[PDB]
Amino acid sequence: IVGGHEAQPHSRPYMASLQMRGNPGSHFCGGTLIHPSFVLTAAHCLRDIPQRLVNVVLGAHNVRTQEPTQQHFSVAQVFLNNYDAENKLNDILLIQLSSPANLSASVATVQLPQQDQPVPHGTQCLAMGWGRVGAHDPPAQVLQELNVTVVTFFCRPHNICTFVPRRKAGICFGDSGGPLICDGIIQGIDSFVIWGCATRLFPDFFTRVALYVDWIRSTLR
Amino acid sequence: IVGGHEAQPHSRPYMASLQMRGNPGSHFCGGTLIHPSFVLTAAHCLRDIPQRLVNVVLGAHNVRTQEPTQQHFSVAQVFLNNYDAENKLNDILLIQLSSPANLSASVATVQLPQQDQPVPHGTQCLAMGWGRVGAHDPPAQVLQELNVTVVTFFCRPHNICTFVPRRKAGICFGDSGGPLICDGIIQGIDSFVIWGCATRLFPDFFTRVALYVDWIRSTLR
Amino acid sequence: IVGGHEAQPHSRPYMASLQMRGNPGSHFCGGTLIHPSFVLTAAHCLRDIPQRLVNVVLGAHNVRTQEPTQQHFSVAQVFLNNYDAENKLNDILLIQLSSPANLSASVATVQLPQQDQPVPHGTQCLAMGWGRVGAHDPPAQVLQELNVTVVTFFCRPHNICTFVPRRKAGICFGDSGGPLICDGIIQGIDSFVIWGCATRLFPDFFTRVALYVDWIRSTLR
Amino acid sequence: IVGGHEAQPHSRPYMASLQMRGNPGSHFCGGTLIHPSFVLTAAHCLRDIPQRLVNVVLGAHNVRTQEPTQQHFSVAQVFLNNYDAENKLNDILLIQLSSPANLSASVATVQLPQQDQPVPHGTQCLAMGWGRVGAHDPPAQVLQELNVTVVTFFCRPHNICTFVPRRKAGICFGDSGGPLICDGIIQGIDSFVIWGCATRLFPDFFTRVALYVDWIRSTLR
Numbered sequence: 001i002v003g004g005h006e007a008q009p010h011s012r013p014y015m016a017s018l019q020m021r022g023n024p025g026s027h028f029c030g031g032t033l034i035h036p037s038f039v040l041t042a043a044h045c046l047r048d049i050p051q052r053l054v055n056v057v058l059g060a061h062n063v064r065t066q067e068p069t070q071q072h073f074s075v076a077q078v079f080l081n082n083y084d085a086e087n088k089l090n091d092i093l094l095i096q097l098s099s100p101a102n103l104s105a106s107v108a109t110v111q112l113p114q115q116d117q118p119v120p121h122g123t124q125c126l127a128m129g130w131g132r133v134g135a136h137d138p139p140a141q142v143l144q145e146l147n148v149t150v151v152t153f154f155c156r157p158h159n160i161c162t163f164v165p166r167r168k169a170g171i172c173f174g175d176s177g178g179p180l181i182c183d184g185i186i187q188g189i190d191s192f193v194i195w196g197c198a199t200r201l202f203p204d205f206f207t208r209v210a211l212y213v214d215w216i217r218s219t220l221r
Numbered sequence: 222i223v224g225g226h227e228a229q230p231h232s233r234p235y236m237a238s239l240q241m242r243g244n245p246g247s248h249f250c251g252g253t254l255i256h257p258s259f260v261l262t263a264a265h266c267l268r269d270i271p272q273r274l275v276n277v278v279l280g281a282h283n284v285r286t287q288e289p290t291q292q293h294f295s296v297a298q299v300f301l302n303n304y305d306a307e308n309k310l311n312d313i314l315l316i317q318l319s320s321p322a323n324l325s326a327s328v329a330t331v332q333l334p335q336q337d338q339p340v341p342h343g344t345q346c347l348a349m350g351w352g353r354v355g356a357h358d359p360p361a362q363v364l365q366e367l368n369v370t371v372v373t374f375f376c377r378p379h380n381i382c383t384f385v386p387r388r389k390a391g392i393c394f395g396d397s398g399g400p401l402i403c404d405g406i407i408q409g410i411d412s413f414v415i416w417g418c419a420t421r422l423f424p425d426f427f428t429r430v431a432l433y434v435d436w437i438r439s440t441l442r
Numbered sequence: 443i444v445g446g447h448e449a450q451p452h453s454r455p456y457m458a459s460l461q462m463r464g465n466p467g468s469h470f471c472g473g474t475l476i477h478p479s480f481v482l483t484a485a486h487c488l489r490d491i492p493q494r495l496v497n498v499v500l501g502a503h504n505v506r507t508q509e510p511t512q513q514h515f516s517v518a519q520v521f522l523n524n525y526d527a528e529n530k531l532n533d534i535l536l537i538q539l540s541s542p543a544n545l546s547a548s549v550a551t552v553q554l555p556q557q558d559q560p561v562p563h564g565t566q567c568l569a570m571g572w573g574r575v576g577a578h579d580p581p582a583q584v585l586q587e588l589n590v591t592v593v594t595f596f597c598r599p600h601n602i603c604t605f606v607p608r609r610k611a612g613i614c615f616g617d618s619g620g621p622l623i624c625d626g627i628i629q630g631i632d633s634f635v636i637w638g639c640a641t642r643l644f645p646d647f648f649t650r651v652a653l654y655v656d657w658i659r660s661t662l663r
Numbered sequence: 664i665v666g667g668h669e670a671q672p673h674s675r676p677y678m679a680s681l682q683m684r685g686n687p688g689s690h691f692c693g694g695t696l697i698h699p700s701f702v703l704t705a706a707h708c709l710r711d712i713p714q715r716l717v718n719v720v721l722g723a724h725n726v727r728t729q730e731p732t733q734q735h736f737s738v739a740q741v742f743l744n745n746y747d748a749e750n751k752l753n754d755i756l757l758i759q760l761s762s763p764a765n766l767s768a769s770v771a772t773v774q775l776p777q778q779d780q781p782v783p784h785g786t787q788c789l790a791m792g793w794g795r796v797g798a799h800d801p802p803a804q805v806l807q808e809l810n811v812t813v814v815t816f817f818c819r820p821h822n823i824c825t826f827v828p829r830r831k832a833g834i835c836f837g838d839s840g841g842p843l844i845c846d847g848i849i850q851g852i853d854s855f856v857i858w859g860c861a862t863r864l865f866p867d868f869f870t871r872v873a874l875y876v877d878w879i880r881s882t883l884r
């Protein structure tokens with residue numbers, strides 16, 4: 001997250017760090033705990049990488065630290081919904097944890113939107129993540145969050161776009177798969193930026209979760 | 222103006238219509254009365270037209286008629302400031318009328334902003350003109366106006382960009398030179414569009430008047 | 443024509459200069475004599491301007507001067523093939539002169555291609571016209587010509603694109619309606635530029651004449 | 664490489680495969696052996712990863728396999744030349760191998776350009792790599808090659824751009840750091856693509872090797 005700020009530690013307990021097994025703090029994407037056993041993330045995060053190498057780390061703040069709150073899981077399975085990499089469509093992935101998370105103080109779930117639920121232009125949401133804090137600066141130890149506004153410009157109905165007009169801010173690399181929080185509900189998943197991070201020229205793109213509620217529910221059976 | 226609405230007759234008494242001398246109703250550009258003997262417009266409106274052929278019409282609503290409210294002037298002198306046509310910078314030109322306007326109801330001046338005064342993203346403005354009301358039928362007989370919002374997306378600081386979020390709307394051919402009125406002050410001048418009118422993807426560009434306030438005033442003295 | 447060079451006088455006898463009647467030298471668009479009574483041009487050239495005020499000048503070289511070689515015609519009739527000004531499609535118009543030109547060394551026709559005849563990438567053509575020589579010097583007096591090559595980049599099959607790979611060159615304002623001749627056949631009509639003239643970043647766009655050949659021939663009755 | 668073809672085995676012996684140390688066939692970037700101890704790559708290849716985890720494989724063809732031609736190296740040091748991740752500038756990195764390669768039949772160096780040496784629009788080159796070869800097809804097993812043409816359209820001088828005129832083809836993910844070979848000389852390094860691979864809209868961008876010729880020389884010795 002570029003130009004956002006440090007979240008209160010564990011203030012967003014549904015936050016998941018996707019890392020590589022055996023290399024702690026090797027965060028490469030965010031995810032969102034939607035069920036004790038399912039992390040919701042971006043389909044693009046899981047490409048370039050075999051499942052077995054994946055490590056879902058829950059209840060963290062500082063991912064490159066051995067927090068007592070941290071809980072680790074490996075991937076039992078993953079489900080996709082016609083992800084189009086060329087068009088950057090359906091960039092959504094449900095990861096089934098090896099084991100169910102222990103829903104504690106620093107580890108919680110979040111509500112899904114209603115199927116086809118709208119997020120209007122002007123909606124203020126929170127975007128968070130451990131991603132790059134500026135395209136030329138070493139990653140973020142601590143979870144960062146950023147208030148953004150849903151915009152319709154330079155956007156596709158497929159996605160939800162956000163923008164920070166006032167300042168140089170937005171999602172960056174590492175933020176992929178993270179959640180976009182609007183009124184306590186996850187409305188988006190970090191999908192893509194254009195050209196770069198915080199260009200101040202285009203919105204940041206998020207997968208529109210409401211499109212896939214029915215699928216997610218049926219997938220959780 | 223695309224997707225705009227007709228202004229109330231003479232509600233915008235500072236609206237000037239640049240016409241071709243000897244051809245009544247030959248509106249090609251808009252302009253703004255800011256001093257009884259000076260019209261402000263875009264440098265680009267007088268690229269391919271010699272000074273002497275310019276007829277500045279004040280007091281209009283329906284420019285395709287000789288309204289009693291009108292007052293016509295020829296051009297005395299024109300002033301510019303480092304206009305760059307390839308980069309589309311400093312698209313500003315001051316036309317000193319052949320004679321002072323006689324301020325009445327239908328003809329009146331507008332105030333200039335202060336030098337380097339800012340116009341933030343989200344600032345609600347008004348655009349107006351007699352440009353094409355679309356690329357599907359002729360330009361506007363009567364003055365059209367459009368409520369727009371200043372945006373900074375896909376924009377450049379030198380310019381003020383606007384955009385109308387919901388619908389197919391924006392400035393078009395013939396609106397070039399007219400004012401961008403924000404809080405009853407002129408903050409911009411219709412300078413350029415990208416590709417076409419009301420692309421719904423690109424914002425409309427305007428010269429940022431606050432940059433040239435000192436030059437303008439200095440010239441008016 | 444930016445970065446072009448002056449043509450040898452009357453070495454392109456099918457070059458038409460479109461002007462405002464009564465106002466000599468007022469070249470505003472190009473044309474191409476393809477028949478004694480027919481000038482082929484871009485539909486956008488006569489968008490605003492009424493037919494009555496247009497003056498078709500043939501036999502010119504320096505359009506800004508009276509030349510014994512020139513022949514003026516008025517617009518008898520104009521033909522359109524479904525011009526889409528927003529998509530910039532079918533930018534072609536047939537102007538029927540009020541009287542047949544008198545073909546000479548200085549005034550001759552140019553042949554059309556066959557319907558759907560391709561013009562492959564790499565194809566070397568000539569573009570010419572009296573348009574702006576760069577938006578820095580006031581418009582071409584004498585005919586300017588430029589060596590260009592057809593390209594498929596950043597293009598549309600509906601159009602024919604050209605680019606001058608090694609120099610800041612290209613068609614400019616005033617060249618619209620002019621011819622793109624390849625192998626002494628007219629293959630395009632100067633239709634539009636992207637951003638401005640000679641961007642060195644976008645190919646110039648031309649109406650693909652081979653697309654409207656039957657319509658054309660038939661219109662010639 | 665998208666729409667490219669399989670290079671003949673060991674026909675491009677200066678090709679390097681940057682992989683994750685301890686992860687056999689974990690190819691993430693290309694490189695070019697320009698000296699027995701130095702591999703040429705893109706600076707963005709070693710952004711995410713730390714150098715103590717980088718495995719530099721020579722003499723390869725199928726990267727997934729344990730081939731008898733492969734020589735594996737470790738990163739001894741790295742060199743940068745003012746890399747700009749914001750603007751994607753100076754995307755060049757010199758890697759010092761822990762040990763010199765044994766210049767054999769399947770492992771050889773490639774010649775460098777002269778400093779400031781031009782590569783004109785129209786120059787035909789070879790781009791090769793083991794990157795993704797199709798958005799839903801994995802990354803290449805075996806070395807892929809593609810003839811591409813150097814273009815100046817939609818480009819900047821800092822970069823060398825290329826395009827394959829009429830075919831969905833070009834570089835792709837995992838092609839980064841690889842070389843652009845023209846007339847048997849390395850002229851570019853795969854830097855970036857715009858939006859995606861083989862959009863057929865934008866050129867692929869390569870680091871312009873000749874700008875850094877002098878820096879690579881002194882750094883080598």
Ligand SMILES: *[C@@H]1O[C@H](CO[C@@H]2O[C@@H](C)[C@@H](O)[C@@H](O)[C@@H]2O)[C@@H](O)[C@H](O)[C@H]1NC(C)=O
Pocket residue numbers: 124125126147181182183184185
């Ligand atoms: C920034 O957002 C803060 C939290 O946002 C609210 O809670 C998050 C989780 C979302 O559900 C979001 O939709 C809500 O607005 C707010 O307390 C705060 O008002 C915002 N900050 C400012 C100064 O804009």
Ligand SMILES: *[C@@H]1O[C@H](CO[C@@H]2O[C@@H](C)[C@@H](O)[C@@H](O)[C@@H]2O)[C@@H](O)[C@H](O)[C@H]1NC(C)=O
Pocket residue numbers: 345346347368402403404405406
């Ligand atoms: C549209 O704008 C109307 C007028 O705008 C106000 O006055 C103009 C001249 C400007 O100075 C502008 O900055 C002001 O907002 C408003 O009465 C109206 O609220 C706006 N309409 C809507 C429905 O958005």
Ligand SMILES: *[C@@H]1O[C@H](CO[C@@H]2O[C@@H](C)[C@@H](O)[C@@H](O)[C@@H]2O)[C@@H](O)[C@H](O)[C@H]1NC(C)=O
Pocket residue numbers: 566567568589623624625626627
């Ligand atoms: C430029 O082109 C000259 C003329 O081009 C040819 O003739 C014109 C009328 C067209 O029909 C065109 O398609 C033909 O290519 C050539 O004689 C000349 O050598 C060319 N010069 C360079 C420097 O390219």
Ligand SMILES: *[C@@H]1O[C@H](CO[C@@H]2O[C@@H](C)[C@@H](O)[C@@H](O)[C@@H]2O)[C@@H](O)[C@H](O)[C@H]1NC(C)=O
Pocket residue numbers: 787788789809810844845846847848
């Ligand atoms: C594609 O390129 C093949 C080899 O390219 C030539 O040598 C390489 C190593 C480069 O240095 C390049 O500049 C040279 O052109 C050719 O054998 C093949 O003919 C090429 N294809 C085409 C369409 O000509």
